[PDB]
Amino acid sequence: ENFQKVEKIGEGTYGVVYKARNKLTGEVVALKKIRLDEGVPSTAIREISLLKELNHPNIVKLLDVIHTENKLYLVFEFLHQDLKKFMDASALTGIPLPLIKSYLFQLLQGLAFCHSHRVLHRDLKPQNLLINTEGAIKLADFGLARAFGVPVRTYTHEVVTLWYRAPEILLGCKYYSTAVDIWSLGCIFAEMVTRRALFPGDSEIDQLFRIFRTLGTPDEVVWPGVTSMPDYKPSFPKWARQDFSKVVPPLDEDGRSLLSQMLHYDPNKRISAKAALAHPFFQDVTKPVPHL
Numbered sequence: 001e002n003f004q005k006v007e008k009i010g011e012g013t014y015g016v017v018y019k020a021r022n023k024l025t026g027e028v029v030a031l032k033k034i035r036l037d038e039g040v041p042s043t044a045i046r047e048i049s050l051l052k053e054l055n056h057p058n059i060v061k062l063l064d065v066i067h068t069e070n071k072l073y074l075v076f077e078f079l080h081q082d083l084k085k086f087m088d089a090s091a092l093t094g095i096p097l098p099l100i101k102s103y104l105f106q107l108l109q110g111l112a113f114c115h116s117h118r119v120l121h122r123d124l125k126p127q128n129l130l131i132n133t134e135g136a137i138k139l140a141d142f143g144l145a146r147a148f149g150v151p152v153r154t155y156t157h158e159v160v161t162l163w164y165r166a167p168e169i170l171l172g173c174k175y176y177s178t179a180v181d182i183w184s185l186g187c188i189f190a191e192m193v194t195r196r197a198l199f200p201g202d203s204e205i206d207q208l209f210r211i212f213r214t215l216g217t218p219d220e221v222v223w224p225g226v227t228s229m230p231d232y233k234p235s236f237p238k239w240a241r242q243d244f245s246k247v248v249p250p251l252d253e254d255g256r257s258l259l260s261q262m263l264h265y266d267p268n269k270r271i272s273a274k275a276a277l278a279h280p281f282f283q284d285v286t287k288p289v290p291h292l
């Protein structure tokens, strides 16, 4: 083939991922084979084709797409570590706040770009945020969820995490607005600051109830229309809202204000990526070099 395996990077949502070298250019890449349940779906065709052109410095670059033997191989730029591993590596000391702020600022730039082209991620999580040794962070697998769907289990039966999923998806609404990615990024922001996942649910109802226990059980006052969501139940227990001061210490008041806006229940109220970039939390943002 055009690409020689270097080693297995891991299992992805849709198939195995290898670090590979392009024979002709000598470039090293992450090669994702997409295994689906007849030919590639025309939905997958339309979506993947848009992704080759959706280029930004905070989006992992899709270098090429090979479609052969009725299967897709997506060839991505290679980055050496993900945020999940970097957070685990930093658990004793935590990621320094100026670096958290830089990462959040760059991720919001990537989101602002994709959202302005009407593309969303829908499955943001620390595993698909990739970092280099210079200070950049990039969104991986952008757009793959609309192209292929989000499965309950991966092809190797691993459970797809619910910890970053927005409440409107958990309540069964099948319209995903760009707000779903702001929610996930807010959860990741809180996790970087506190060194603990914010809502580590292990089932859809456990995920919802963890959200409710922190933010209050939603009602029509805070989220007009919530009681019309397909999976809303009037019998959900009523929990009161906790103050964010207890949820993300030692984050400052600007950071807590930004977080609360990214975690509004109503997707119509939730801050957009563009507005979030103008928030005073980023007034003193810098681009540090990480240790790793």
Ligand SMILES: *CCC(=O)N1CCN(C(=O)OC(C)(C)C)c2ccccc21
Pocket (backbone or CB within 6 Å): 168, 172, 173, 174, 175, 224, 225, 226, 228, 229, 266, 267, 268
């Ligand atoms: C999943 C569809 C959706 O966008 N919905 C569902 C209900 N909803 C809403 O306002 O419904 C009426 C009260 C107008 C019937 C709502 C509200 C906020 C966000 C998303 C939705």
